[PDB]
Design a protein around this nucleic acid. Structure first.
Ligand SMILES: Nc1ncnc2c1ncn2[C@@H]1O[C@H](CSCC[C@H](N)C(=O)O)[C@@H](O)[C@H]1O
Length: 327
DNA sequence: TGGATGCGCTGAC
DNA sequence: GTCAGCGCATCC
């Protein structure tokens, strides 16, 4: 994550829904905002969240009386994506995990914050012939909010990640916000190789599969894209090896394959998956952030997470717009 | 809502 | 045809 000198969100309160690791919290706090509520029902996510912020998030949002939620200015919510991801079955709202957005609407309808900042996977934008995004848009409009949605690729904002997500920023209409803009892309100067840990700390992640098939030659020049170098097994998810001279493939929460949830990389002649600390780094997390003691849970958590830097630029722009109040 | 890995199918070229 | 995906069902 980057340092923010002009703290555009100073004096603003926000809630961290579907908190997870608290990526939205790191991003908004870096801009000066104060978190006044967090909700996360996963046992392990609650532990790491508490480990880093000192508080246990409240559980299952579907059972929380929205009236009990503290007053806040900005509602943050990177809601469940298994039901909308290109990698899943796409049952969308038909999925028991795909109706959480309506819980968000319920809370918005009651607390009416100034801003609603949501995040979901790229496919959410086109799922069900665009009907899914349209439903969210109309719901927010009904609630008297403007709706700004755009897919941003993390590689355009200083993080070597193919992470592509749809970001939705909603402003309560009475605020008459007309200058909100998504961050403009800038040149990537950091690549996977730059965030890797020393070899001595990741020897245990090195795997030598005799069914490894190098398909492409290693590149010597860094490039802002994923560069596949080979595969193991049939080359399915978690069975693809990439160049550290390129960018990291999207992390996943329930991913499989021998290089589960991170993908495989060619590092000094060896092939290995990423270390939880490396996952944290490719997601924009500071080294000061404490990962969960279970590597399996840590991989899952970062796989579900957001790229901090991207949320930082968005948060900064949200604040920039809320502060432009000329006479 | 354990940890691990082989897998298969969709979306966007 | 190419390839990537906050995933899935199953095994212990
Ligand atoms: N009904 C529910 N109540 C509370 N949390 C829920 C929930 N259903 C799913 N979640 C949590 O929603 C999260 C969605 S992933 C969001 C991760 C978050 N942005 C962070 O930066 O990491 C998951 O951690 C999941 O455990």
């Amino acid at each position: 994550m980057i340092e923010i000198k002009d703290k555009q969100l100073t004096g603003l309160r926000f809630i961290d829904l579907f908190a997870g690791l608290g990526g939205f919290r790191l991003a908004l706090e870096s801009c000066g905002a104060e978190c006044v509520y967090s909700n996360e029902w996963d046992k392990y996510a609650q532990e790491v969240y508490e480990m880093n912020f000192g508080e246990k998030p409240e559980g299952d949002i579907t059972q929380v009386n929205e009236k009990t939620i503290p007053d806040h200015d900005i509602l943050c919510a990177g809601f469940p994506c298994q039901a909308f991801s290109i990698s899943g079955k796409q049952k969308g709202f038909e999925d028991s995990r795909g109706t959480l957005f309506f819980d968000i609407a319920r809370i918005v309808r009651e607390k009416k914050p100034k801003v609603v900042f949501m995040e979901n996977v790229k496919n959410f934008a086109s799922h069900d012939n665009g009907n899914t995004l349209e439903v969210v848009k109309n719901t927010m409009n009904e609630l008297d909010y403007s709706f700004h949605a755009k897919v941003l690729n993390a590689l355009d904002y200083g993080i070597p990640q193919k992470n592509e997500r749809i970001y939705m920023i909603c402003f309560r209409n009475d605020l008459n916000i007309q200058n909100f803009q998504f961050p403009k892309p800038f040149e990537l100067n950091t690549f996977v190789k730059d965030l890797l840990l020393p070899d001595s700390e990741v020897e245990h992640l090195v795997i030598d599969r005799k069914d490894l098939v190098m398909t492409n030659q290693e590149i010597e020049q860094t490039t802002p894209k994923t560069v596949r170098l080979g595969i193991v097994g049939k080359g399915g998810q978690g069975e693809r090896i990439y160049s550290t001279r390129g960018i990291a493939i999207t992390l996943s929460a329930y991913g499989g394959g021998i290089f589960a949830k991170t993908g495989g990389y060619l590092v000094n002649g060896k092939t290995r998956k990423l270390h939880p600390r490396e996952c944290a780094r490719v997601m924009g997390y500071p080294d000061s952030y404490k990962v969960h003691p279970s590597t399996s849970q840590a991989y899952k958590q970062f796989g579900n997470s957001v790229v901090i830097n991207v949320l930082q630029y968005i948060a900064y722009n949200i604040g920039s717009s809320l502060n432009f109040k000329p006479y």
